Design a protein around this nucleic acid. Structure first.
Ligand SMILES: [Mg+2]
Ligand SMILES: [Mg+2]
Ligand SMILES: [Mg+2]
Ligand SMILES: [Mg+2]
Ligand SMILES: [Mg+2]
Ligand SMILES: [Mg+2]
Ligand SMILES: [Mg+2]
Ligand SMILES: [Mg+2]
Ligand SMILES: [Mg+2]
Ligand SMILES: [Mg+2]
Ligand SMILES: [Mg+2]
Ligand SMILES: [Mg+2]
Ligand SMILES: [Mg+2]
Ligand SMILES: [Mg+2]
Ligand SMILES: [Mg+2]
Ligand SMILES: [Mg+2]
Ligand SMILES: [Mg+2]
Ligand SMILES: [Mg+2]
Ligand SMILES: [Mg+2]
Ligand SMILES: [Mg+2]
Ligand SMILES: [Mg+2]
Ligand SMILES: [Mg+2]
Ligand SMILES: [Mg+2]
Ligand SMILES: [Mg+2]
Ligand SMILES: [Mg+2]
Ligand SMILES: [Mg+2]
Ligand SMILES: [Mg+2]
Ligand SMILES: [Mg+2]
Ligand SMILES: [Mg+2]
Ligand SMILES: [Mg+2]
Ligand SMILES: [Mg+2]
Ligand SMILES: [Mg+2]
Ligand SMILES: [Mg+2]
Ligand SMILES: [Mg+2]
Ligand SMILES: [Mg+2]
Ligand SMILES: [Mg+2]
Ligand SMILES: [Mg+2]
Ligand SMILES: [Mg+2]
Ligand SMILES: [Mg+2]
Ligand SMILES: [Mg+2]
Ligand SMILES: [Mg+2]
Ligand SMILES: [Mg+2]
Ligand SMILES: [Mg+2]
Ligand SMILES: [Mg+2]
Ligand SMILES: [Mg+2]
Ligand SMILES: [Mg+2]
Ligand SMILES: [Mg+2]
Ligand SMILES: [Mg+2]
Ligand SMILES: [Mg+2]
Ligand SMILES: [Mg+2]
Ligand SMILES: [Mg+2]
Ligand SMILES: [Mg+2]
Ligand SMILES: [Mg+2]
Ligand SMILES: [Mg+2]
Ligand SMILES: [Mg+2]
Ligand SMILES: [Mg+2]
Ligand SMILES: [Mg+2]
Ligand SMILES: [Mg+2]
Ligand SMILES: [Mg+2]
Ligand SMILES: [Mg+2]
Ligand SMILES: [Mg+2]
Ligand SMILES: [Mg+2]
Ligand SMILES: [Mg+2]
Ligand SMILES: [Mg+2]
Ligand SMILES: [Mg+2]
Ligand SMILES: [Mg+2]
Ligand SMILES: [Mg+2]
Ligand SMILES: [Mg+2]
Ligand SMILES: [Mg+2]
Ligand SMILES: [Mg+2]
Ligand SMILES: [Mg+2]
Ligand SMILES: [Mg+2]
Ligand SMILES: [Mg+2]
Ligand SMILES: [Mg+2]
Ligand SMILES: [Mg+2]
Ligand SMILES: [Mg+2]
Lengths: 209, 14, 56, 120, 122, 114
RNA sequence: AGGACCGAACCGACUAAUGUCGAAAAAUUAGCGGAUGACUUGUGGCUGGGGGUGAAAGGCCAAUCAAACCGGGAGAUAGCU
RNA sequence: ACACAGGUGGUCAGGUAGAGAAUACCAAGGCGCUUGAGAGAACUCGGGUGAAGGAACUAGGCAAAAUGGUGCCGUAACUUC
RNA sequence: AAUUCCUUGUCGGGUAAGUUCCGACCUGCACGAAUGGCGUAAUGAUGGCCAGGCUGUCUCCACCCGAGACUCAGUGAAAU
RNA sequence: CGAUGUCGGCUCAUCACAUCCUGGGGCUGAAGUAGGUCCCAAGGGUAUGGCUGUUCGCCAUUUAAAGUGGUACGCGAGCUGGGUUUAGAACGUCGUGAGACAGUUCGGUCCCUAUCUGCCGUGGGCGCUGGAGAACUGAGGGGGGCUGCUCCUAGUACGAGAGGACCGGAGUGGACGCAUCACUGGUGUUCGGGUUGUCAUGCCAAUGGCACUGCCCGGUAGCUAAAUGCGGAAGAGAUAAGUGCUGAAAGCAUCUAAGCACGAAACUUGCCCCGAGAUGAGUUCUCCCUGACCCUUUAAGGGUCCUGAAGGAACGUUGAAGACGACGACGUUGAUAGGCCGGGUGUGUAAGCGCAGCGAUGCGUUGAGCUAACCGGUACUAAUGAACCGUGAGGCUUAACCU
């Protein structure tokens, strides 16, 4: 089915009576309000656009404000989109709560991983460090060779070099839903999800069974 | 100039 | 380490196509003294947002 | 990679930074307004405003803390004698930064930092 | 975290005193041996009339590590040294008849029941 | 976070007694040999305490049959059934890691009797 | 007492790193050797080019050494480029 | 060749600790080394710390780590004693 | 063997595993007696090998402190 | 030959397939297990040590396996320098000798600030035909794809016994990857404490500087691995080798000629990420601007005045964003940062005072004091009115509909 848009509310653990400790990420999933329903006749595919949270009526622009007023919902902190799965139908202005996940066992969570900035090859690609001693000249964390010789005469595309690490769209799949608490608007999922505290997460039912 | 340094020895292609 | 051919005036100017300075888009007029100044900077006489703050 | 970290290094080591901010705190308490660089002023807020918060309560242990942190008895007296009573009702924010152009010799962003009572 | 060249104390009375891990068994490129793990050892130090000889190559099961085991609740059990029980090289079947120092529940399996029974603790 | 504090309060146990590093403490924890649920005692000196609300832990250092053992217990973990202070110690450090390189007579803490 | 020992100055230069369009045409930093002697150092002097001097490496003889440098024979000669 | 991390003989040489002209902190005295201001990526340099392991590194324990003082006890083979 | 080609000779020791090392053998390609032979205490910034300790040398890197690198202002090269 | 750096190692690879493992199959002198041989198959994977400068090889112990080759037997403007290749020295040997040795032995400077191509990242410009804010589609591209063991089936099939399955399930690992910091830890020169030497604050007391953070002991946040969650798939399509069904040519036979099936980690998908400069520049939603004159070759023309929207940019406070740009959040109608308040955390019973003691010191006040980056609040300070850019209804042709 479709997913929800939550916010990463940090991590903690659930102690169970049988003794186990479960590391859970806490995702506050407020009501996702449908701002637009896309269909084959007009858009060519079936999806719902949702919003969540709240913005200020000075940071919401006139185009955004009109797009929200057409739906009848109040402005949220952005818009997301979920493809419909042939069996569900949503109306503009409908609220979807975390109760959508009441029966879900595993979810995929998509976040924007924490940004590491410009990373070297050791950190970014698990490149092996060269010698610390034994004669090494200024070449301890340097990448080593990047190509062969005259015969290729070039570096191949997709060479693992240094560059921007993190700050990108990551999906962690098949995380156990530990708890769905509808009154608190909370989803407790086992393990870590991408991103920092307070970042948007997209939680949808697991695509691999 | 007046002083030209000796060039560095080549790689010993021997 | 070093070039095999000298670059051209064309390549030189194309590289310098990003070296152009940006002028300050606008200057601020002081509430009280009416002097020009940078946003969020005191004026040359020591006013900021209409009040004498330095008296230099 | 600097996530959630505070404190400007200011291209100094820790001992030099500590001594420089001790001196600058003394100078700001003495003159009630000083012209420095903008990053130095922003970093000096976190040095001088705790000193005034300390000086709000006048005990011997507080005098000795202020001395351990400023190393100037004239400064420790101006705090606890003038600035503490002056800012007794301020809930923080005893300093004000005013950006003032750029330095001639190196084009450094300049800022005045003053105490918000200096209206005389 | 036992790897090759790690020296372990001997937790049984098979005669060995210090052994060296020469191979972490099970899996290519496998790096470490935790508690319930079988390693290949050589005997670096033994007692004169023991059941094993110095320089013997055989197997051993780790029973205590300084690194320790973590429990499902997050708890940790660490020890002040790495110890192992020597096993016959073909069938594991501990060589000694006594076992010194405590062990952990991680050793409660079908093949180390002898060890879990002979141990003086846990 | 208020949300996480609310989720952790509802799990924190209230029976947790007061103890300090240096105190000799018996921790009774739950052991499972399959069907039966037994209670096992671990008595030793508290060498470290980590106060983090629900994530609080404490390291107890025992000297078992020969080998010395340390056990980091999670305080609010349901496997820890009970914590009792058998003896109060009079150290003046928060962490007693120097007790690791001490044995016998050099490893004994004077009693607090405060 | 000692071409004794440990160790500063001092005299060296074993290792490593840096530097290698250097701070430096030989260094710096950390260690290292000798450190009352066949020691080290100042000032002055003497030995000179097939000559000197050399606890000897063809080492050194003014950042030049299997024959210094300067000037001359000299526009040597160059079946080579 | 430089306002150059080099070289350059002699004399004077205080305090506390110290065996000391070592070393640390100071005195007298003299300086902050003639680009600064920010930021706080990779990587390089110079350092600090490090779970478990402990030479598995490597040509080689290179480098690093380690040892380190005084007094007393005690000290093997071998020896030219 | 600073000498031995075959050759990593053989046997012994040391290692789980030793082309190195140490001991011995002698089949010395091609030792040998002042161009000295053999030994040798002490000595050596000497060559080789082993052990204890010690460790970021390594498994396998992590973090931190500074100087650069990066941005701004000023000055302003070089090989090619 | 007016120089194309030469072994091995390291680092990083990349391709082939003559395939080492895993996958599929035929034959077997294939009972099972386990093999042999051949065919298909390159998706992924494909040891650590001792010796030696080694490539190689020997050995030890693993592994599902420890593939074979190409790539200047890849890779020194990436590293090393043990070997080979200078100058010293010695041995054996050769030579009268100087010297020589695919003989050995000890020692012996490894430069380059990247212009271009390439590659990894990240921006600016313009375009995309009125402008703008969003959300998408998805051409196309990349990533990923490994595998052990145990148990059930079942001690069943098979087998005289020994031994011992296929097929199909379940669990738990190794290596690899992604994320994260709840836990366990590392770090934590920005927190607290102990302590040595010395100097200073007049002195005592208390503090501060310096001594590598002087040396240490702990330790917040952040970052992080050794910590912890997750992943490789299932499925689908089309196939390889192979196996067929029906079936003539060729009355039979025949997998093939017509036709119809099955068939593998290979291929296309499915999973994840990028992605409309996809100039073939796409779609959807929303928002904004509907004022006049002059001139000329009355041109998709130029000029003047008035008008400046949506939005943006700039500036400021900044960020779990970041080299810089960029990106995100705020700018008084405000929690953006600092301060402050409360808490937490860490350290660990401050100072002063009093008491005991000859004193060092202990005790009480007191789990005190202090406490970074944390949490929750709070306009005290700083985020200024403005100004700036961006316009004024958007070409032609044709077609389809209301006039
Ligand atoms: Mg970041
Ligand atoms: Mg170098
Ligand atoms: Mg280096
Ligand atoms: Mg430029
Ligand atoms: Mg911050
Ligand atoms: Mg200091
Ligand atoms: Mg309590
Ligand atoms: Mg002497
Ligand atoms: Mg000297
Ligand atoms: Mg000399
Ligand atoms: Mg040397
Ligand atoms: Mg000597
Ligand atoms: Mg000496
Ligand atoms: Mg003289
Ligand atoms: Mg010679
Ligand atoms: Mg000379
Ligand atoms: Mg001549
Ligand atoms: Mg001449
Ligand atoms: Mg002539
Ligand atoms: Mg001529
Ligand atoms: Mg100068
Ligand atoms: Mg000078
Ligand atoms: Mg002295
Ligand atoms: Mg001195
Ligand atoms: Mg740095
Ligand atoms: Mg260190
Ligand atoms: Mg370590
Ligand atoms: Mg520690
Ligand atoms: Mg350790
Ligand atoms: Mg050890
Ligand atoms: Mg080795
Ligand atoms: Mg190796
Ligand atoms: Mg090496
Ligand atoms: Mg060394
Ligand atoms: Mg050292
Ligand atoms: Mg010979
Ligand atoms: Mg021999
Ligand atoms: Mg001879
Ligand atoms: Mg003779
Ligand atoms: Mg000598
Ligand atoms: Mg060895
Ligand atoms: Mg630069
Ligand atoms: Mg500049
Ligand atoms: Mg040539
Ligand atoms: Mg040429
Ligand atoms: Mg093939
Ligand atoms: Mg393949
Ligand atoms: Mg392919
Ligand atoms: Mg595939
Ligand atoms: Mg070797
Ligand atoms: Mg061989
Ligand atoms: Mg070549
Ligand atoms: Mg090659
Ligand atoms: Mg190259
Ligand atoms: Mg090479
Ligand atoms: Mg190089
Ligand atoms: Mg060499
Ligand atoms: Mg020679
Ligand atoms: Mg694909
Ligand atoms: Mg691919
Ligand atoms: Mg945390
Ligand atoms: Mg810690
Ligand atoms: Mg620390
Ligand atoms: Mg931490
Ligand atoms: Mg004084
Ligand atoms: Mg005092
Ligand atoms: Mg001083
Ligand atoms: Mg000093
Ligand atoms: Mg499939
Ligand atoms: Mg604030
Ligand atoms: Mg007290
Ligand atoms: Mg007190
Ligand atoms: Mg006191
Ligand atoms: Mg406290
Ligand atoms: Mg507080
Ligand atoms: Mg106000």
């Amino acid at each position: 089915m479709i997913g929800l848009v939550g916010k990463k509310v940090g991590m903690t653990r659930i102690f169970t009576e049988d003794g186990v400790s479960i590391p859970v990420t806490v995702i506050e999933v407020e009501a996702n309000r449908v701002t637009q329903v896309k269909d084959l006749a007009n858009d060519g595919y079936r999806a719902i656009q949702v919003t969540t949270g709240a913005k200020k009526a000075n940071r919401v622009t006139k185009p955004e404000a009109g797009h929200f007023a057409k739906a009848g919902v109040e402005a949220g902190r952005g818009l997301w989109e979920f493809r419909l799965a042939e069996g569900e139908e949503f109306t503009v202005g409908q609220s979807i709560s975390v109760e959508l996940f009441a029966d879900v066992k595993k979810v995929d969570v998509t976040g924007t991983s924490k940004g590491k900035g410009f990373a070297g090859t050791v950190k970014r690609w698990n490149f092996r460090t060269q010698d610390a001693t034994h004669g090494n000249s200024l070449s301890h964390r340097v990448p080593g060779s990047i190509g062969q010789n005259q015969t290729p005469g070039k570096v191949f595309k997709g060479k693992k070099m240094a560059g921007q690490m993190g700050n990108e769209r990551v999906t962690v799949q098949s995380l156990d839903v530990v708890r769905v608490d509808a009154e608190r608007n909370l989803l407790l999922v086992k393990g870590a999800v991408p991103g920092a505290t307070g970042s948007d997460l997209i939680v949808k039912p697991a695509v691999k069974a | 100039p007046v002083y030209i340094p000796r060039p560095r020895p080549p790689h010993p292609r021997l | 380490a070093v070039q095999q051919n000298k670059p051209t005036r064309s390549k030189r100017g194309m590289r310098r196509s990003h070296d152009a300075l940006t002028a300050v888009t606008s200057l601020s007029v002081d509430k009280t003294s009416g002097e020009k100044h940078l946003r969020h900077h005191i004026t040359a006489d020591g006013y900021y947002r209409g009040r004498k703050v330095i008296a230099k | 990679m600097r996530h959630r970290k505070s404190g400007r290094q200011l291209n100094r080591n820790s001992s030099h930074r500590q001594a420089m901010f001790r001196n600058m705190a003394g100078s700001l308490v003495r003159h009630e307004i000083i012209k420095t660089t903008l990053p130095k002023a922003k970093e000096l807020r976190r040095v001088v405003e705790p000193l005034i918060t300390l000086a709000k309560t006048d005990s011997v242990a507080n005098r000795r803390l202020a001395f351990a942190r400023t190393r100037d008895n004239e400064i420790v007296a101006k705090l606890f004698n003038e600035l503490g009573p002056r800012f007794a009702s301020r809930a923080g924010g005893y300093t004000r930064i005013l950006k003032c152009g750029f330095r001639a010799g190196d084009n450094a962003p300049m800022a005045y930092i003053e105490l918000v009572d200096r209206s005389e | 975290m036992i790897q090759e060249q790690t020296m372990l104390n001997v937790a049984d009375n098979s005669g060995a005193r210090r052994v060296m891990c020469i191979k972490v068994l099970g899996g290519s490129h496998r790096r470490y041996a935790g508690v319930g793990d079988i390693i290949k050892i050589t005997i670096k130090e033994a007692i004169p009339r023991g059941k094993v000889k110095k320089g013997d190559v055989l197997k051993a099961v780790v029973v205590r590590t300084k690194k320790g085991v973590r429990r499902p609740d997050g708890s940790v059990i660490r020890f002040d040294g790495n110890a192992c029980v020597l096993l016959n090289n073909n069938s594991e079947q501990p060589i000694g008849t006594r076992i010194f120092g405590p062990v952990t529940r991680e050793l409660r399996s079908e093949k180390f029941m002898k060890i879990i029974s002979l141990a003086p603790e846990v | 976070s208020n949300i996480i504090k609310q989720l952790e309060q509802e799990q924190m146990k209230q029976d947790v007694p007061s103890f300090r590093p240096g105190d000799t403490v018996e921790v009774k924890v739950w052991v499972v040999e399959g069907s039966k649920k037994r209670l096992q005692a671990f008595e030793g000196v508290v060498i470290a305490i980590r106060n983090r609300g629900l994530h609080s832990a404490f390291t107890v250092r025992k000297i078992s049959n020969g080998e010395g053992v340390e056990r980091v217990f999670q305080t609010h973990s349901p496997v820890v059934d009970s914590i009792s202070v058998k003896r109060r110690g009079a150290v003046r450090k928060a962490k007693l890691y120097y007790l690791r390189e001490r044995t016998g007579k050099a490893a004994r803490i004077k009693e607090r009797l405060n």
